[PDB]
Structures are given as structure tokens and as C-alpha cells.
């Protein structure tokens, strides 16, 4: 049958993972690849080349989401879509996102080798960026595909990066967004434009590895939020300003970072997380008291209400700390605060069937990380396929999934796509 | 008499202050001017030109200390020296250091206008740098003049900036250190090579302003120290690594910063200060748990032993925090730990006499900030003249000393130099 005929070039897929990892602003084994930079452009070209070699119709939208389509026997039907991202936060791994892009292309080649004849078209999506590194916005591409007018407006009017480069300027430097009449609404997909959307991704947790299982069938995605906070004080000479007269913005930040941890632990649930990944002091000189501090705070929970309580407590603590330290809470911005999503029940059903037909062990599980799937779920039925990764490591160079782990995920992806195409 | 004849071009001196501030990597009204950068080179040329116009014989040493001499009637005698620095930490003011260089040149012009004829030569020193911004080393020029073989060795062998540019490489780009065969010992001055050394400087405190006084006669300089600390953890995915499994290096840093403040307050003396002016996270991404954190801590006291006690407690707290957070204390380095200096009693007497002859109110007082005078005191009898500054602001763009305050300090400098020249 189709399932027994599926054959993946495992070392070849690994070789492509390794080649793509060379497009990096960090030295191997780390990867840094930020939206619209030269490294991102190089990686885009590499992926577009592979799409063309696999015989896909390749196109790009106004923000650089990249699409590769295999036309089905009934091309007017809503297509079955799959994809992920290739951007990489500073000093991260080679597998996050990339497995779902390179592995999707491989899934197409696997199906072509087996002589599969799609009814619904299959389309691979390289999302323009999923990481919030550059503009503080996560899933920038899929948020726009899912129709966020709020985001489109901000991208056109206010959004800049940490070097004060505007989104429009960055996009144009990489060959995109060159239309002054476009408010980016051109990117929006109609609900139902896809029959379904699947994303293959490394687990970013240790569960499949620990339990000796091949495949995770993802049933839900946890609810993510991010906050941007700034404190302002008088600053001045570290040696000359006596302690009673200070309002140290650095210490306000230190206190807020510890309060974040505290409020997370207050939830009484293991599923709650919160992190201060960014804490910067200005002017940032050893002999100058910080007059401004800037924190970027990530917090999530599978339970939206519990997550929201943490955010509310964090805001209360920021105000309490500001008053006690006699600094100004000059910014408290909820950059995003998104609900969790549920995978479509019939997509889950086909994925579990596919894994079973391939003699692969599997379990139902939730994603703790967020993914483009979170926002694609607003447009169409969604599912995710997890593969194991070593010790669950991710967002760091120790991140690892074996050639066989990837090949298994690719086979499940190929077979689920085929089932959905013929449905 | 000489005292009544002294007259300063106050708006002229202000114009020079403003012009020098233009040599900055930060936009007005802030100044940034770091050792050996292009802006530093431009500012050096500007000052050397003023020295030339004032009739001074100009020379430079191996590291770019700049000397301008007015030859006395007995030129073989040890000269009376005066000067300060012109480098500026990021986003600081335009009066710190600058007043003591531009004002020293103006003191020469003032004495010349009055027909004063020095017996001992007068020599103005532009110290190559006082701020520790580039290499973590404060008073680099005066530490070498005072004969630190340890510093000379490090500068030749290990010292680099945060961009891994070596001291030698940086120095050569600015036109200095062009001798392979110099161990920098050429910079060293013999004890007694100067009869006395004076530094005019803004108070960097609010005391003279609050008390309604013209001049501070500095009696001592507080004992400064600085430390570098690093913590290391495992890092990973901020959304997926559950709280019990973390060893967050950023939270370890937050805890140490608060410990610094606590230990300072434990001294029970208002003369004790401590600051965390630098706190950096790696990788520094919102969705990446910090795996490395880096703190640079400044701590001082007029009492050396009381400060050292703070330093010991900070080291103890760093170890306790590391163990509790389950991170490695990967670095704890005392970058400098220097004793206080006492101003020379005869210099103090002459300075107070000068202020009195000029009908300027004054008090004897301690300097809380450190200065090149701290190290020149090892070579020569030392004293400092403080002028008031607005609300004591320093190391920030709000720093301000009035044209009149500066002129008063220049007159006291002129008259004190004249007294010491004619001993
Ligand atoms: Mn990621
Ligand atoms: Mn990802
Ligand atoms: Mn200073
Ligand atoms: Mn200074």
C-alpha cells in the first residue's frame, strides 16, 4: 500500500538540515537567523530552490510568506497545507521550525516517489517568521494570514526593531512589501481557504523520548502572552549619589523579575511558566546608576484564565515596585495575549491512523511552545505532529532530533497529507 | 595685586565646553566619548590646538597622555602640574573632566594676561582617559604615570575591550604606542617629578550648591572598587522548560543586585555606596531562558575597611545564590580595589588662601567620586578644587555648572598654581 511504500532519504534530509544551519550569525553549533537579515535571505533562497526542484509552484506574499504548491486533480478545492518557520532566535538550534519546512518538502518528494495522485492540492508554507526576535512580534506571518487588521496597521505605522529600522524598511531590504497602497490586507486568507493545516515540529520536550514513543499527536497549544515593561529613575553618578537619594531602575527590574517567578509559582499548576529573557539597563555603564530598565516577559499556561491571573499579578507588582522604588512605570505593554487552540478532531484522527499504519507508536499530547499552527487554526482545521528530541532541549545548540526521528515524522506527515487530500 | 587682576573669559570658556561636546557618539545634550575612538581623536586635536594657542610646548607619551608646558624662570625645577580627562561615559554630561582641562588652559591664559611669571614651570595634563568604559580600567593614564607595572603588563598582554580589540591595537589606531619594544614603562613618572598636582573638577554632589558656597577644598578621595560577576545555567525554551527544572541565570543576577544594595545598607554609614550599573543576559531573547548573566558592580567608601566588608559579603552572597539557584558562579573578579588618597596639607592651605584672597566662600570636603588626582597623589603632593554643579547631577546630560562657577574655579586654580610656582 501507500504507507508501506513511503521511503525517506534520512541522511539527505540531515544534510539539508546541516546546510541550512550554515546561514547563521552565530558560529556552529549555534544558529542565529533573524527575519529579513542577509542570513534569512540566504536561507529563503535555499528553501525556494528545493521547492522548485520538487516541482512546486512557488510564490510569495507581501511579507514574504513563501508557498509551494503541488496541484491536485481537483485544484479548485481548498488545498491541504503544511509548513513551519526557518528563523532562529540568538544562539539556538538547527531543528526548531526547520524540520517542518525541510521535512514538508521531503514529504512531497516521498509522495511523488510513491506515485501518489493528490485530489486536493498540497501546499507547503514557509512562514516568513515565527520568532519575536526582531520586532517583538511572534508568528508575524501566520498572524497576518489569520487576518489581524490590528497587526497589519501596526506594521505599517509604528513597528520598528531595536535599531529603529521600520518593518517596512527591513522588509524592503529583503525584497518585500514594496507597495505603498497595500495596507498588508493582501496577505489575509479567507476562512476555509485551506481544507486543513498540519505542522511537523520537534517536541521541545522530553516526553516522547522518556516514554519510548515515535510520534506525538498534538491536541492543543498552550496560551501565550508577552509583556514589555520599562522603569525610569533619575540615574546619576554611582560613586556620588548617596543611597537614600536613589531611585534605581535596575533594582526595580530585579524586583519585578523575581515577582514574575513568584506569581507563576503561585498558580499551583506545573503547566504555568513565566520568564524574563530580556533585561537591559540604560545607560549601562559600571559607574552610572541605571535611569531606565527594560524587561521583556514571556508567560504561558494551557489554561487561559490561570495565565491571565499571572499577567494581572505581574502588572500589580510592577506598580507596587514602581511606587516603593520611587521610579516611574513608564511602559507596561501587553505585546500579545493569545488564547490556546484546539487541534481539529478529524485531523487528529487521521494523524493517529497514519502513525498506526506506519507501525509507529504515538500518544496524544499538548504543545507548550506556540507555533504558526496556533494562528492557522483560526483559518482552517489544524493539527501538529511531534517527533522526539534529545532531553527535550530547544532554543539552544544542544537541541537534537535523529535522522530517523525526522524520517518517521516525515512519513506520518506524508501519509496524513495523502489521507486529507483524498478525503 | 595678582588676585584682583585675574579675569576669566567666562562666555568664551562656555563656548569651548559646548564645542568639545560636539565630539560625541550620542546626540546633544548627551555626550559619549570613549578612549581612542574617532570622537576622542577629534577632541584631543581640539584641546592640543588650544594648548598651542596658549603658547604651551606640547608633548605626548606612549599611551596618549598629553602635556602642555609653560616654561618657568627656573625650568629644571619640578613643575606644578594640573589637569583632568575629557573622555565621557555613555550618555553623560559635558562638564565632567572637561572643566579641569579647558579650565586649566584658561588658567594659563588668565595668568598670562596678568603678567604672571612662573618660577617653577606650569604643566597642563590631558590624561589619556579616566573612565573605565572601554577596557574596564579606570584612570588608565594616571595609573601608568604613577608607575603600575601590573597595569603596564596587562595592557601589553591581555587587555581587550568588549569587541575583542586589544589596548595596543586601539592605541595605535589613535596614533599612539608605536613602539614594539616599549613595555609602557616609559610612561612612568619618578616620585617628585612634579612639585604638586592640582585638579579642578565639578563637585558631582549638591553640597556647595545647598550650602551656598563657591569652592570646595578637597581633603580626600574615597576608596573605589569594582567587581565582575558571571553566573551560568542550562538555558532552554522559555515556554517548554517547566519551573522545577530551571536554573535561571538572570534570576541569580537579580538576586545578587539586590544583595549588593542590602550589604551597602548594612554598613550603617551614609558614606557607603554600591551599584549594579551593568547587568546583561545571554542569549537575551524573550523566549530563551538566560543561560549566562553578567554583572559589573561599583562599590566605594571613604573607609577602606568598611568597603572591603561590603565586598566580602557580596562574594558570600554570590556563592549562596549560585548554590540556591543551582547555577555555576563562573566568574567573580575584583577588577580594582584601591585605597583612598589624602590631599597634601600645604596644598590645601594654599588653595584655601587663594579662595579667601579672591573673596570666594569655601569649605573643606571629601570627594566621593574618584579622579586622576587619586593616582597622581602617589607621585606628588595633590589637591583638588571643586566648583558647584546643579543639584549635584553628573554622569547624565542634566549635569551643569554655570559660567560663573567655572570662572571662580579657574581663578582659584590660577592663584593656587601661582602660589606653588613661587614657593
Ligand atoms: Mn522556537
Ligand atoms: Mn518552532
Ligand atoms: Mn566621571
Ligand atoms: Mn571626572
Swiss-Prot record, chains A, B:
Any single GO BP term: ureide catabolic process
Annotated site residue numbers, Necessary for dimerization: 246
Record's keyword annotation contains Transport: no
Subcellular location: Endoplasmic reticulum
Domain of life where this protein originates: Eukaryota
Phenotypic consequence of residue 370 to F: Reduced substrate affinity and enzyme activity
Keyword annotations of the record: Endoplasmic reticulum, Hydrolase, Manganese, Metal-binding, Purine metabolism, Signal
Pathway the protein takes part in: Nitrogen metabolism; (S)-allantoin degradation; glyoxylate from (S)-ureidoglycolate: step 1/1
Annotated Gene3D superfamilies: 3.30.70.360, Zn peptidases (3.40.630.10)
Catalytic activity: (S)-ureidoglycolate + H2O + 2 H(+) = glyoxylate + 2 NH4(+) + CO2
GO cellular component terms, A-Z: endoplasmic reticulum; plastid
Enzyme class: hydrolase
Region (Involved in dimerization): 223-338
E.C. designation(s): 3.5.1.116
A molecular function GO annotation: ureidoglycolate hydrolase activity
Annotated binding of substrate, by residue: 130-131, 201-204, 237, 287, 300, 370-371, 395
Cofactor: Mn(2+); Ni(2+); Co(2+)
Deletion consequences: No visible phenotype under normal growth conditions, but mutant plants show a slight reduction of growth on a medium containing allantoin as the sole nitrogen source and accumulate ureidoglycolate.
Record InterPro entries: Amidase_Cbmase, Bact_exopeptidase_dim_dom, Peptidase_M20
Reported impact of residue 237 to A/N: Impaired enzyme activity
Record's subunit section: Homodimer.
Family under the similarity heading: Belongs to the peptidase M20 family.
PANTHER family membership: ALLANTOATE DEIMINASE-RELATED (PTHR32494:SF19)
Role played: Involved in the catabolism of purine nucleotides. Can use (S)-ureidoglycolate as substrate, but not (R)-ureidoglycolate or allantoate. The sequential activity of AAH, UGLYAH and UAH allows a complete purine breakdown without the intermediate generation of urea.
The protein's name: Ureidoglycolate hydrolase
Primary gene name: UAH
Amino acid at each position: 500500500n501507500l504507507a508501506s511504500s513511503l521511503s525517506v532519504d534520512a541522511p539527505g534530509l540531515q544534510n539539508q538540515i546541516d546546510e541550512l544551519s550554515s546561514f547563521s550569525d552565530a558560529p556552529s553549533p549555534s544558529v542565529t537567523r533573524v527575519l529579513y537579515t542577509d542570513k534569512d535571505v540566504s536561507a529563503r533562497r535555499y528553501v525556494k530552490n528545493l521547492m522548485a526542484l520538487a516541482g512546486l509552484t512557488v510564490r510569495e506574499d507581501a511579507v514574504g510568506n513563501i508557498f509551494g504548491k503541488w496541484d491536485g486533480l481537483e485544484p479548485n478545492l481548498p488545498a491541504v497545507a503544511t509548513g513551519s518557520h526557518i528563523d532562529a532566535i540568538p544562539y539556538s538550534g538547527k531543528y526548531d521550525g526547520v524540520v517542518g519546512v525541510l521535512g514538508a518538502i521531503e514529504a512531497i518528494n516521498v509522495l511523488k516517489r510513491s506515485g501518489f495522485k493528490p485530489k486536493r492540492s498540497l501546499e507547503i508554507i514557509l512562514f516568513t517568521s515565527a520568532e519575536p526576535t526582531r520586532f517583538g512580534i511572534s508568528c508575524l506571518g501566520s498572524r497576518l494570514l489569520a487576518g489581524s487588521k490590528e497587526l497589519a496597521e501596526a506594521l505599517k505605522t509604528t513597528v520598528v526593531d531595536g535599531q529603529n529600522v521600520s518593518f517596512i524598511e527591513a522588509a524592503r531590504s529583503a525584497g518585500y512589501a514594496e507597495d505603498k497602497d497595500d495596507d498588508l490586507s493582501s496577505v489575509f486568507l479567507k476562512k476555509g481557504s485551506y481544507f486543513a493545516f498540519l505542522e511537523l515540529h520537534i517536541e521541545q520536550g522530553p516526553i516522547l523520548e522518556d516514554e519510548g514513543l515515535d510520534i506525538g499527536v498534538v491536541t492543543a497549544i498552550a496560551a501565550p502572552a508577552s509583556l514589555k515593561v520599562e522603569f525610569e529613575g533619575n540615574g546619576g553618578h554611582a560613586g556620588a549619589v548617596l543611597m537614600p537619594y536613589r531611585n534605581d531602575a535596575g533594582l526595580a527590574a530585579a524586583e519585578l523579575a523575581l515577582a514574575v517567578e513568584k506569581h507563576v509559582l503561585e498558580s499551583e499548576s506545573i503547566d504555568t511558566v513565566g520568564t524574563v529573557g530580556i533585561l537591559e539597563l540604560h545607560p549601562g555603564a559600571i559607574n552610572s546608576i541605571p535611569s531606565k530598565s527594560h524587561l521583556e516577559i514571556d508567560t504561558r499556561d494551557i489554561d487561559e484564565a490561570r495565565r491571565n491571573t499571572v499577567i494581572k499579578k505581574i502588572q500589580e507588582s510592577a506598580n507596587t515596585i514602581a511606587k516603593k522604588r520611587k521610579v516611574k512605570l513608564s511602559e507596561f505593554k501587553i505585546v500579545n495575549q493569545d488564547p490556546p487552540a484546539l487541534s481539529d478532531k478529524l485531523v487528529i484522527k487521521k494523524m493517529a491512523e497514519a502513525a498506526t499504519e506506519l507501525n509507529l507508536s504515538h500518544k496524544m499530547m499538548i504543545s507548550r511552545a506556540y507555533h504558526d499552527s496556533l494562528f492557522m487554526a483560526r483559518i482552517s482545521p489544524m493539527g501538529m505532529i511531534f517527533i522526539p528530541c534529545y532531553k527535550g532541549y530547544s532554543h539552544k545548540p544542544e537541541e537534537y532530533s535523529s535522522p530517523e526521528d525526522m524520517a518517521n515524522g516525515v512519513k506520518v506527515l506524508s501519509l496524513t497529507l495523502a489521507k486529507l487530500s483524498l478525503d
